[PDB]
């Protein structure tokens, strides 16, 4: 999290946290309530978000659900929407954490090797994450939408 | 400041080495500013000759941003 | 331009020596892309490549953050000098550096020591040294190097 | 390391569960204590040298044998080592208080510390007493609100040694 | 490296003076443009892969001989080095735009880049055209004011190379 | 500053700035006008603060102005107040930057051996900076005085 | 000890001691009785040396026992004289050792951090050891005064 | 490490005492024996290669299987390591005799030696008989008093290994 | 490096002749000065801190612009670098005085110092003034003959930096 | 020499010489004169040393000057005696220096490779140095013989 990153950066220098790091932690904890409200909003509408994002992704990329596509069939489509659900949960974790760390350790480190082991096209993942970003940012106000879009953009860049 | 570009020869006096070592005799290397005192001290201790060092990255006399 | 494959082999050996294994899942190649470019162009030597890997945030998360300073001294000595912590004086010296200046001065104190210059110089990636001297260096080094990550 | 927020995140990630009401309650609790933790950390940063001064003075007043000839803290080198250990303890207890979690204590302080002190002949009881002295001085400086929280991490460290 | 704020601080510290009215004006000018820079940097980071995609496509369409045999970008290795160089230019132009100052550019991109490219045989004019393609794609992406901001640093890179 | 520290952090691992880094940059630029008017207030009132802090110093520790003291005499006392003026200017730079980085780079890195070369006792420097902190936070409002206080406490901790 | 230094230097080079080092050991072993005479002479004048050195130090630096000084008061002056007595014992140890090693591992390693934690001024320590030098070399013949002043100068330079 | 002089110094430092008549007596005893110690060290150093010659010859005569194929001293490399270890023992025993104390033995030879050899299948008993072979050879060269002196440190190494 | 004895050995080896009368006279001359050099080295070692103290005070008194804003020695960092350089100059001139030869100054001081200072923009004339200041300060403490001997190496350093 | 080794040892730790190290240098410069007389005696009688050593070597090892040997021939015998002259000069250098450092850094590093390129048998060189030591120690007194034979033994061990 923000606090953890400040602590490790201070410990790397064998010092106490600087005035800037303390201001960073104060800003993070002061805005914790709106972060929790955003995470609650995303959690409440996770099913709607996943269905709409899956529809958008399969409309923009019909080849995935066509025969020979990596997501062809009921079980593969279920696995696809399951991965989208995984990443939505990770984005909520990132919102509450204030940084993309939990996203990174849970679903970014090793992701290329995993989806390579799964014949999963990374451009498909990028398109799916962009679709889920648009659907999610639709359900939030602009000030919160920009913040959540930054986590989604980090996820898309990591999959790119 | 923040970077020196160092060209130094380091001769061998302790032994004649079986490997070529013409990796390590004559060289040009980029060394960061806070590194250079210790680095130059080292090349001086093994008897090397500092042929030149140059400013590359930063500007001399800066008070911050170093 | 030439001997590209040998040089990439050297780069990956340096990764395996500093981080104890391949770090492809951590996208180590793109993290150190500029560093690799400089080392290809012969702007820097192998020692500065090792210094940049051992002072990296990835190295700090792998081997500095998880462990107490004594284990930090012995791990970084294994990775950078090829041997376990040697005596009490070395432990005092690196403990004091870690306590007062932190992680990066500790790494540079290891790498700027005379011992690294004599053993590995500026061109060879460090390796297990199987040190015969002094007393207890050999078994401690073997215990450290017979351990998986 | 791990803090309270990452602890909740890990707990819910292992279950593969989105955050429920209890998770949000714990997150609100940490966000509510955050400003107190930040004030305590800033105060300790401001007065760390004084804390170590007064804590070491109190420890060596209660146990004068430690700094007199024959004591484990009798020499300039061993006195500096004692003060360096107490500086470790203060800084890492401050980190653990700012994190709201004792994980950093286990993974940067306590692992192998008893073996190090037993190899060196360092008295464990007197180190624990020095940690109590740091606890008293730090609690006096940070105030009643943060003293209870800070004492949790000091007590964790003392119980880890003892 | 220097941002705008550090540049002002350095000037007024070399002169040993406190901030006068002009320095405060420059600081306000930087602060007012800060949110614009943050939005443009986030947009560029979101679309960095796409920007490099299309910029390399335009570069190799206007100059197809680069990737055909005999071209400097004819190999998987040399094409990879070309697109990686473009990645470097985009990332450091983003750094420079966010700092509001060009010291990072010449400090960590441009020192010896002309000499290195001349030693390697990299065509300077082709790299300049590639940087201009990056300029056009990024400008059409971010927005007019952010387009001008990024254009300043892209032009700094182009002038430094040529 | 905040921007330089974030950029060097992101350049260390060869990436673009993370959402947390962009968030801290936004927090810094949003608070720019407040810290800038704080720098105002500390800047027009340099002389009052310097002289009051010197008075408080000499009152708390009289050895320095006593025989055998480092500030004994008129010229040494003038240089003593000159050093306080230096450090107040460095504090203003740190406030505008959002970090203490100018403070290290100009007056903290190497201060120990400089003052040791000058026969200047570091406890006296700590007393000086604490006196200056008290006088300066007297002139500021509570929120502004607090954030100036953190920079002054950092200066005191770094001095000794 | 001289023998210890010779053995350690030989061990660093993984060799037996050269006839030069053996000759050095023979010289030290031949000078041992004179060293013991000097050590006994200093030890017998323990209290006189400490008292006179404290007097000269406090007259040369009145601010140390002046209010606001580190040695203000009876008990802090007693601790000051105890520190001087420690260092006198260390000097006798160094005399019999034939080198400054025991002085170093008992009183010089970490003395900077120790006296910093004790807010003891190091310069005042230097005038204290110089006063000890004067007093102790006053009771010895010129030849013995030379070696004793050598150890006192090592101590003064180590504290400074 | 530690020698006789440093041993007296440390004993009186742990007590916080200036030297007494007993301390001066011990120091005079060491200074009395210094010349004999130097002569023994010089004659050992002059004849170290010969001592190793004979000691290894006796050990491999009494225990032929060590140098027969499959023995722990069967290869040029392992035989070289064997005689190198014997030279190590001789050099450090000379160091200890010259110092008049066995602390260097524990610190720089015996520490980790038993488990060094056990991790290598080096016969510890055979190493002990090699050490007695060195003892017997050295005693005949250094003379009766220096023989009894060197025997103390050789037996110290033998007992620490056993 | 090489000392006076080694310098004679090299000058006779490169010409391949045995030591004649003149070589032995030079060696006797060096041995005669040994006690004086050792006394001067001990005195400088005792008072090195003070020499740097008051030499830097004189240098910055004669050139106050060096330590005022805009000067090369204006910061705690750059003032620290300046006094570190003066301390190293004093210690290495002391080494050279002990050795009786200026080879250590060439190998370990002047080896890259001129052009390192040129790159850093360090003012050479002020460095020469600082070396001269250390020269008078050391002379006052070491007396006539030792002051002449130290002045030789100080003037060598001044010429090398110039 | 000893002074150079001490200076290098101190420069390793970036410190001035210890009082014991200065005492070591004092002992060295005290023994310098007797070393000078010893080297004077050796350099005066170089012709007879070379003649006797060469004759003794060739009688002990007739195969060297016998047909098929490396030393057979007038010019080759001259080269052999010239090598003996080199090594005598180096021994004198080492005696004045008080250490084997000049001996090694002119005639020990790479000596095996040189004599391998020259077909020169190493045991022949060892026997030459031994006979040369016997003659030199015969010409010198009892006290000088020990240290003079020390360098010859070092050289023989280097060749062996
Ligand atoms: C693998 C390719 C390669 C080569 C061939 C090479 C040559 C070379 N020979 C060297 C030493 C030397 N080489 C020579 C030989 C020369 N002087 C004599 O007059 C001869 C005419 C001539 C030889 C034919 C000498 C005398 C030295 C010692 C120089 C010194 O350090 O004083 C050195 C300095 C490093 C060392 O001392 O080991 C180099 C770099 N370097 C390389 O990296
Ligand atoms: C961050 C986790 C961590 C800690 C805390 C730590 C402590 C530590 N303490 C040490 C020595 C020491 N520690 C002490 C302190 C104790 N003795 C005094 O009497 C007191 C009662 C008490 C302190 C309150 C002393 C005296 C020594 C010196 C022991 C010796 O050298 O013999 C050492 C050996 C290295 C050295 O001497 O510099 C370590 C590594 N190591 C770690 O990795
Ligand atoms: C000699 C070493 C070398 C190679 C191999 C190389 C490959 C290469 N293929 C390219 C385009 C391409 N390559 C392909 C081929 C792919 N399309 C389908 O997915 C298939 C799986 C697959 C073919 C089997 C396509 C379709 C393009 C056009 C890309 C575009 O126009 O956007 C390009 C971009 C410029 C161009 O069109 O020439 C390069 C540089 N370049 C080199 O210097
Ligand atoms: C972050 C600062 C930085 C930069 C900018 C940088 C550029 C750089 N590019 C290089 C190679 C290269 N760069 C290019 C790219 C060029 N050739 C194509 O024709 C294009 C026209 C053009 C790109 C738009 C190519 C093809 C190479 C390979 C050269 C070769 O191996 O022959 C190299 C040599 C080392 C290597 O091959 O990895 C450097 C140092 N390095 C740095 O550390
Ligand atoms: C911007 C960073 C910076 C700093 C801080 C700085 C301080 C500084 N203070 C100096 C002198 C001095 N400074 C002091 C101040 C001391 N008097 C009391 O003891 C106090 C404890 C203490 C001040 C609060 C005194 C007394 C002197 C005169 C020393 C002398 O002449 O012996 C000097 C020597 C030149 C001069 O006389 O002006 C410097 C360089 N220089 C820098 O470039
Ligand atoms: C054997 C090595 C060794 C030394 C040297 C040593 C010194 C030492 N001096 C102390 C106190 C002290 N030491 C001094 C002496 C200083 N005050 C004056 O200004 C003078 C400049 C200077 C003496 C000449 C004073 C005044 C105190 C009392 C400090 C206090 O009560 O807080 C203490 C604190 C514990 C105690 O008083 O028992 C130590 C450990 N300890 C050691 O184990
Ligand atoms: C498999 C690798 C290996 C080798 C080669 C080896 C050699 C070896 N030869 C030995 C003895 C010996 N070796 C020789 C051979 C020499 N006599 C003449 O001078 C010749 C020049 C030369 C042989 C052509 C002799 C005569 C001895 C007896 C030495 C003695 O008993 O004093 C010994 C001592 C133990 C024993 O006698 O059984 C070893 C270890 N050991 C090994 O583990
Ligand atoms: C062992 C022999 C040796 C020496 C002495 C040496 C000097 C040296 N001085 C340096 C910087 C410096 N040196 C000085 C000193 C100058 N400024 C003042 O005006 C004076 C006139 C003058 C000194 C009397 C200063 C101010 C700097 C910092 C310059 C900067 O960073 O802008 C540096 C750059 C690295 C660093 O700052 O840590 C070196 C290597 N190098 C060596 O290998
Ligand atoms: C100062 C350091 C140094 C040494 C030691 C040295 C030795 C040396 N001896 C040489 C020739 C020689 N040296 C010898 C001597 C051998 N003949 C017998 O076997 C003896 C065992 C032995 C002498 C005791 C002989 C026979 C040659 C003639 C080789 C030939 O021409 O084929 C040569 C070839 C150049 C020449 O002949 O002028 C060298 C370099 N050179 C040096 O610069």
CSV table of C-alpha atoms and ligand atoms in Angstrom, one decimal, chain I residues 13, chain J residues 57-58 61 64-65 69-72 75-84 86-87 89-90 106-108 111 114-115 117-126 128-129, ligand 9:
chain,number,residue,atom,x,y,z
I,13,UNK,CA,68.4,-1.6,-12.0
J,57,UNK,CA,77.5,-25.3,-10.2
J,58,UNK,CA,79.2,-26.7,-13.3
J,61,UNK,CA,75.9,-30.3,-12.7
J,64,UNK,CA,74.6,-28.2,-18.2
J,65,UNK,CA,77.9,-27.4,-19.9
J,69,UNK,CA,73.1,-29.2,-22.2
J,70,UNK,CA,71.6,-25.8,-22.2
J,71,UNK,CA,74.7,-24.1,-20.8
J,72,UNK,CA,77.1,-25.7,-23.3
J,75,UNK,CA,78.3,-17.7,-25.2
J,76,UNK,CA,75.8,-19.8,-23.4
J,77,UNK,CA,78.1,-20.1,-20.4
J,78,UNK,CA,78.5,-16.3,-20.5
J,79,UNK,CA,74.7,-16.0,-20.5
J,80,UNK,CA,74.5,-18.3,-17.5
J,81,UNK,CA,77.1,-16.3,-15.5
J,82,UNK,CA,75.3,-13.1,-16.5
J,83,UNK,CA,72.1,-14.5,-15.0
J,84,UNK,CA,74.0,-15.2,-11.9
J,86,UNK,CA,71.6,-10.4,-12.3
J,87,UNK,CA,70.5,-12.4,-9.3
J,89,UNK,CA,72.6,-7.6,-7.9
J,90,UNK,CA,69.0,-8.3,-7.0
J,106,UNK,CA,62.6,-7.7,-11.0
J,107,UNK,CA,63.4,-11.5,-11.1
J,108,UNK,CA,60.6,-13.7,-9.6
J,111,UNK,CA,60.6,-16.4,-14.1
J,114,UNK,CA,60.8,-17.1,-19.1
J,115,UNK,CA,63.0,-20.0,-18.3
J,117,UNK,CA,60.8,-20.2,-23.1
J,118,UNK,CA,64.6,-20.5,-22.7
J,119,UNK,CA,64.8,-24.3,-22.1
J,120,UNK,CA,66.6,-23.4,-18.9
J,121,UNK,CA,66.2,-26.2,-16.3
J,122,UNK,CA,64.8,-24.9,-13.0
J,123,UNK,CA,66.7,-27.4,-10.8
J,124,UNK,CA,69.9,-26.0,-12.4
J,125,UNK,CA,68.8,-22.5,-11.4
J,126,UNK,CA,68.1,-23.7,-7.8
J,128,UNK,CA,73.1,-22.2,-9.0
J,129,UNK,CA,71.4,-20.1,-6.3
K,9,LIG,C1,67.0,-9.5,-14.1
K,9,LIG,C2,65.9,-10.5,-14.4
K,9,LIG,C3,66.3,-11.3,-15.7
K,9,LIG,C4,66.7,-12.6,-15.8
K,9,LIG,C5,66.9,-13.6,-14.6
K,9,LIG,C6,66.9,-12.9,-17.1
K,9,LIG,C7,67.4,-14.2,-17.6
K,9,LIG,C8,67.7,-14.5,-19.2
K,9,LIG,N1,68.6,-15.4,-19.6
K,9,LIG,C9,68.7,-15.4,-20.9
K,9,LIG,C10,69.6,-16.3,-21.8
K,9,LIG,C11,70.3,-17.6,-21.0
K,9,LIG,N2,70.4,-17.8,-19.7
K,9,LIG,C12,71.0,-19.0,-19.5
K,9,LIG,C13,71.3,-19.6,-18.0
K,9,LIG,C14,71.0,-21.0,-17.7
K,9,LIG,N3,71.9,-21.8,-18.2
K,9,LIG,C15,72.1,-23.0,-17.3
K,9,LIG,O1,71.3,-23.9,-17.5
K,9,LIG,C16,71.8,-22.3,-15.8
K,9,LIG,C17,71.0,-23.4,-14.9
K,9,LIG,C18,71.1,-21.3,-16.0
K,9,LIG,C19,71.8,-20.0,-15.3
K,9,LIG,C20,72.2,-20.2,-13.9
K,9,LIG,C21,71.4,-19.5,-20.7
K,9,LIG,C22,72.1,-20.8,-21.1
K,9,LIG,C23,70.9,-18.6,-21.7
K,9,LIG,C24,71.1,-18.8,-23.2
K,9,LIG,C25,69.8,-19.3,-23.9
K,9,LIG,C26,69.9,-19.3,-25.4
K,9,LIG,O2,70.5,-18.4,-26.0
K,9,LIG,O3,69.4,-20.3,-26.0
K,9,LIG,C27,67.8,-14.6,-21.4
K,9,LIG,C28,67.5,-14.3,-22.9
K,9,LIG,C29,68.1,-12.9,-23.4
K,9,LIG,C30,69.7,-12.9,-23.6
K,9,LIG,O4,70.3,-14.0,-23.8
K,9,LIG,O5,70.3,-11.8,-23.5
K,9,LIG,C31,67.1,-14.0,-20.4
K,9,LIG,C32,66.0,-12.9,-20.5
K,9,LIG,N4,66.6,-11.8,-17.8
K,9,LIG,C33,66.3,-10.8,-17.0
K,9,LIG,O6,65.9,-9.5,-17.5
